[PDB]
Amino acid sequence: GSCKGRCFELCRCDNLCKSYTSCCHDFDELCLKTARGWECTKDRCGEVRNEENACHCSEDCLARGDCCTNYQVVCKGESHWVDDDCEEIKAAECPAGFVRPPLIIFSVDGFRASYMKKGSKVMPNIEKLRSCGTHSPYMRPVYPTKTFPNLYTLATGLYPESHGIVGNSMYDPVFDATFHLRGREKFNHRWWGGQPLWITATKQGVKAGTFFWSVVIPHERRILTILQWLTLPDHERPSVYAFYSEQPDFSGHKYGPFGPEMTNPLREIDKIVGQLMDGLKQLKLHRCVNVIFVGDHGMEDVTCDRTEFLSNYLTNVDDITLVPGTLGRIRSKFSNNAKYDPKAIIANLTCKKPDQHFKPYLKQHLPKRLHYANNRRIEDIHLLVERRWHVARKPLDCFFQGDHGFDNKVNSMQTVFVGYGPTFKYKTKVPPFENIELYNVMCDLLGLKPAPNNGTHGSLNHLLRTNTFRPTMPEEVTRPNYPGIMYLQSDFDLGCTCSTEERHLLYGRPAVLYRTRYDILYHTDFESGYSEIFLMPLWTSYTVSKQATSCVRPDVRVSPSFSQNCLAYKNDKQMSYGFLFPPYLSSSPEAKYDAFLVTNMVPMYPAFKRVWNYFQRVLVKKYASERNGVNVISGPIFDYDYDGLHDTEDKIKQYVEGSSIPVPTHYYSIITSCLDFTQPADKCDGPLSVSSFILPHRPDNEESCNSSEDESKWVEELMKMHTARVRDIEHLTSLDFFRKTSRSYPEILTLKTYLHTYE
Numbered sequence: 081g082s083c084k085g086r087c088f089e090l091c092r093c094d095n096l097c098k099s100y101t102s103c104c105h106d107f108d109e110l111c112l113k114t115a116r117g118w119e120c121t122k123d124r125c126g127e128v129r130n131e132e133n134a135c136h137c138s139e140d141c142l143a144r145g146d147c148c149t150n151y152q153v154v155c156k157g158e159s160h161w162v163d164d165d166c167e168e169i170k171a172a173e174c175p176a177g178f179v180r181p182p183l184i185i186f187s188v189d190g191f192r193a194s195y196m197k198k199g200s201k202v203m204p205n206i207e208k209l210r211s212c213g214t215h216s217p218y219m220r221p222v223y224p225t226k227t228f229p230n231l232y233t234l235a236t237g238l239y240p241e242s243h244g245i246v247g248n249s250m251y252d253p254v255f256d257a258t259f260h261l262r263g264r265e266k267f268n269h270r271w272w273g274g275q276p277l278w279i280t281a282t283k284q285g286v287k288a289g290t291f292f293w294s295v296v297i298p299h300e301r302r303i304l305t306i307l308q309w310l311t312l313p314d315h316e317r318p319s320v321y322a323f324y325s326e327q328p329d330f331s332g333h334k335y336g337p338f339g340p341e342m343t344n345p346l347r348e349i350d351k352i353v354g355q356l357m358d359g360l361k362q363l364k365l366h367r368c369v370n371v372i373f374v375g376d377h378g379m380e381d382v383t384c385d386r387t388e389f390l391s392n393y394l395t396n397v398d399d400i401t402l403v404p405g406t407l408g409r410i411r412s413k414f415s416n417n418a419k420y421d422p423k424a425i426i427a428n429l430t431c432k433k434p435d436q437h438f439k440p441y442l443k444q445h446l447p448k449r450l451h452y453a454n455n456r457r458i459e460d461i462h463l464l465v466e467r468r469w470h471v472a473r474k475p476l477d478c479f480f481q482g483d484h485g486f487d488n489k490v491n492s493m494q495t496v497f498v499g500y501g502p503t504f505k506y507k508t509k510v511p512p513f514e515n516i517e518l519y520n521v522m523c524d525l526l527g528l529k530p531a532p533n534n535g536t537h538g539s540l541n542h543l544l545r546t547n548t549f550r551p552t553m554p555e556e557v558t559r560p561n562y563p564g565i566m567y568l569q570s571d572f573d574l575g576c577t578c579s580t581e582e583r584h585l586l587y588g589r590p591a592v593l594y595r596t597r598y599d600i601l602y603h604t605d606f607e608s609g610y611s612e613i614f615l616m617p618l619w620t621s622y623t624v625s626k627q628a629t630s631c632v633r634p635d636v637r638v639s640p641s642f643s644q645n646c647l648a649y650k651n652d653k654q655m656s657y658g659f660l661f662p663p664y665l666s667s668s669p670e671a672k673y674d675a676f677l678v679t680n681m682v683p684m685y686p687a688f689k690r691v692w693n694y695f696q697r698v699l700v701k702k703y704a705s706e707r708n709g710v711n712v713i714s715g716p717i718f719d720y721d722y723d724g725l726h727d728t729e730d731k732i733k734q735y736v737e738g739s740s741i742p743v744p745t746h747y748y749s750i751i752t753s754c755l756d757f758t759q760p761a762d763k764c765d766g767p768l769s770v771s772s773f774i775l776p777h778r779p780d781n782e783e784s785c786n787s788s789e790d791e792s793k794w795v796e797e798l799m800k801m802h803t804a805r806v807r808d809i810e811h812l813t814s815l816d817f818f819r820k821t822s823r824s825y826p827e828i829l830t831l832k833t834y835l836h837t838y839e
């Protein structure tokens with residue numbers, strides 16, 4: 081038919097139309113007018129009207145809402161938004177008929193965090209949002225640090241494993257299809273799981289501007305269309321809008337992050353922001369719209385002379401398919417492949433040299449913090465590549481100088497966040513956080529109930545002036561038991577030859593959030609929650625001051641029937657044991673005899689003891705010195721389905737030979753002290769400092785190439801790699817930490833999401 085008066089309505093005339101659709105025949109005539117450019121010059125200030133022009137420099141254009149963004153500035157004399165000083169926005173100065181403040185999401189591709197320190201009069205509009213608004217030093221993307229998984233994470237509050245968009249390129253073996261950046265397949269909705277903000281909003285009655293733009297639509301027009309939509313009738317006007325830009329990522333790829341040619345792109349991007357901000361100013365909405373400026377990921381120096389090649393480690397590379405780049409995802413090219421040997425492949429990639437620039441991993445063995453396993457679309461073998469490098473098949477694979485996609489805790493991959501407007505705080509500086517968290521935030525701004533996500537709702541209230549959500553601490557589902565002396569040393573046939581709570585449990589007992597049965601067990605130097613179902617402790621709290629054998633005794637508070645026994649570990653060639661509270665840190669020889677209790681013991685592979693012994697005898701003390709005492713809480717994890725969630729007993733696939741003692745996949749530790757370190761851990765009266773890790777429980781150390789040398793050359797390096805958020809351990813244990821503190825519960829939520837990166 082025609083687009084007589086329907087340009088970008090919310091025969092087709094909408095945003096996705098110039099992309100594998102046919103659009104109405106007149107759609108370029110009417111909608112993509114581009115005559116006489118975008119910015120008004122003094123030349124046109126009178127100018128009678130004209131349908132052919134991009135925008136209009138007439139003295140009636142305000143009423144139409146089809147002015148150029150610089151009309152009120154050039155012709156009527158006012159100033160750009162960027163030159164005006166900044167008042168506080170104590171509440172929204174929105175026009176009548178505005179139900180809430182609109183949200184405008186401004187997404188920039190590859191805007192590395194550090195760019196903010198570059199740019200004085202390169203980015204004067206952005207610097208002004210930054211400084212007047214709520215900002216953080218940096219923002220952490222999800223892994224992989226690639227465009228599609230992050231924008232969809234940002235849309236959904238979900239990790240990639242859950243929303244399905246697991247990379248720019250991927251292969252679903254069940255659709256038997258391939259998803260790509262180029263192509264029409266990605267427009268099939270089957271690939272896109274979860275609930276994105278724009279569907280959440282519409283399902284609750286809040287209109288949304290369509291987030292995607294066809295490629296053939298210039299930036300300046302995307303802006304104008306937004307400002308046009310804002311002027312629509314109230315009933316039709318959206319509350320949430322978004323703008324995505326391919327820059328500065330493109331340039332970054334040509335010239336690298338820190339090139340000389342990057343200034344220009346960053347100027348171009350401030351301009352488009354300025355246009356947005358003079359456009360808002362014009363319609364009288366610059367003290368009314370909520371503005372988020374965010375990136376999808378950072379950008380690193382990557383050149384093709386730094387490329388490792390599979391053909392140097394594998395003799396027949398033509399039989400496998402590699403998604404190459406800044407990660408590797410390996411699989412069989414053919415589905416009939418007899419000579420395909422995943423074990424042989426992982427063998428031939430593992431520490432063939434000291435300084436190898438990638439490390440192979442079955443997907444269930446990567447660090448848990450990446451949340452990168454648990455989707456059939458993630459290949460089993462997966463390569464983690466070193467910063468500044470690349471991976472490829474043969475030499476057959478220089479143009480590019482920057483790239484991204486690395487492990488999301490590396491610095492160059494960190495990206496930006498600024499929130500400016502009525503609901504956001506004023507000139508305030510919140511600590512760094514993760515992008516999964518923002519779906520909840522955007523939900524709150526619009527007053528939406530968020531879909532279940534992987535953001536911890538309440539962890540980011542400290543950004544907002546005005547909070548709908550008051551986070552309620554989860555109720556406990558299993559009350560513990562406090563056994564006294566209930567049994568006699570002689571009942572036990574195990575075969576084994578041989579002021580507590582106030583000091584060792586500083587934040588209250590962890591709450592068990594699933595149905596099980598456990599007992600609290602006090603001792604002098606530590607305390608524990610002992611699972612009668614899993615036959616070892618779910619947790620073990622203790623505290624070490626700054627100044628701080630094969631015997632196994634049975635514990636008379638616990639039935640022999642709910643206890644482990646030495647004769648299994650004696651019968652399992654591959655399995656030994658260790659303790660969760662170490663004997664080496666014993667306040668007394670007498671007290672030492674509790675450390676050897678069977679209730680304190682746990683299954684450990686000998687290759688793991690090396691690591692664990694080193695953590696307990698060396699590191700905890702080292703930390704204790706460094707941090708003014710520490711409170712440790714270690715325990716075990718069962719995630720045989722690698723879904724990131726605590727397993728039921730029927731999930732466990734390994735036991736100690738002939739027993740019902742479950743073998744953990746990982747062991748955790750949460751280590752806490754006072755932020756203000758000059759106070760000692762046990763007598764802290766203020767904010768907390770937490771660090772934590774989830775060490776994979778492996779029968780070999782093939783992941784650590786330097787494990788031939790002494791523990792002090794490699795264990796800490798392993799531990800830094802498996803660092804974790806407390807919340808990450810909560811999911812894996814179904815426990816709940818930090819419940820009795822002097823701190824408000826939103827702040828404990830922020831401490832629970834913190835991750836020590838080790839930059």
Ligand SMILES: *[C@@H]1O[C@H](CO)[C@@H](O[C@@H]2O[C@H](CO)[C@@H](O[C@@H]3O[C@H](CO[C@H]4O[C@H](CO)[C@@H](O)[C@H](O[C@H]5O[C@H](CO)[C@@H](O)[C@H](O)[C@@H]5O[C@H]5O[C@H](CO)[C@@H](O)[C@H](O)[C@@H]5O)[C@@H]4O)[C@@H](O)[C@H](O)[C@@H]3O)[C@H](O)[C@H]2NC(C)=O)[C@H](O)[C@H]1NC(C)=O
Nearest residue numbers: 241242243244272273274454455456532533534723724811
């Ligand atoms: C991060 O937060 C998410 C969201 O809460 C958590 O994932 C949820 O976990 C629960 C508990 O295991 C699962 O519950 C099950 O749900 C099904 C029914 O759910 C189906 O339909 C709903 C439709 O409204 C949908 O949410 C689900 O979507 C999944 O499945 C699709 C394919 O079948 C897929 O397109 C989509 O991307 C998503 O796949 C991912 O999850 C599935 C597991 O469901 C998994 O196969 C795959 O590896 C992907 O990771 C689903 O269709 C009930 O019948 C069950 O009894 C049970 O209640 C939710 O399904 C699940 N939802 C999502 C979106 O992941 C994560 O566990 C959490 N992770 C962490 C670490 O905290």
Ligand SMILES: CCc1nc2ccc(C3CCN(S(=O)(=O)CCCN(C)C)CC3)cn2c1N(C)c1nc(-c2ccc(F)cc2)cs1
Nearest residue numbers: 185187231234235266267269272273274276291292322324
């Ligand atoms: C990378 C550019 C891009 N290109 C496409 C193409 C197609 C799509 C697809 C269109 C259809 N949707 S969907 O219908 O909602 C899927 C519905 C699934 N449910 C039925 C389960 C899928 C997304 C997204 N693209 C995107 N993407 C990814 C975008 N995300 C944002 C975005 C994101 C967040 C921001 F806060 C700002 C912007 C701009 S664009």
Ligand SMILES: [Cl-]
Nearest residue numbers: 244455456457
């Ligand atoms: Cl799926």
Ligand SMILES: [Cl-]
Nearest residue numbers: 505506508545
């Ligand atoms: Cl404030």
Ligand SMILES: [K+]
Nearest residue numbers: 647648738739
């Ligand atoms: K036994």
Ligand code: NI
Nearest residue numbers: 215216217509
């Ligand atoms: Ni800062």
Ligand code: NI
Nearest residue numbers: 399419420421
């Ligand atoms: Ni092969």
Ligand code: NI
Nearest residue numbers: 572574575576
């Ligand atoms: Ni005994």
Ligand code: NI
Nearest residue numbers: 656685686689
């Ligand atoms: Ni041993």
Ligand code: NI
Nearest residue numbers: 693694697791
């Ligand atoms: Ni040691």
Ligand code: NI
Nearest residue numbers: 625709761762
């Ligand atoms: Ni102390």
Ligand code: NI
Nearest residue numbers: 767768827831
């Ligand atoms: Ni705190």
Ligand SMILES: [Zn+2]
Nearest residue numbers: 189190227376
């Ligand atoms: Zn990107």
Ligand SMILES: [Zn+2]
Nearest residue numbers: 249250251258
């Ligand atoms: Zn692929």
Ligand SMILES: [Zn+2]
Nearest residue numbers: 190329333484
């Ligand atoms: Zn890119």
Ligand SMILES: [Zn+2]
Nearest residue numbers: 719725726727
């Ligand atoms: Zn699990």
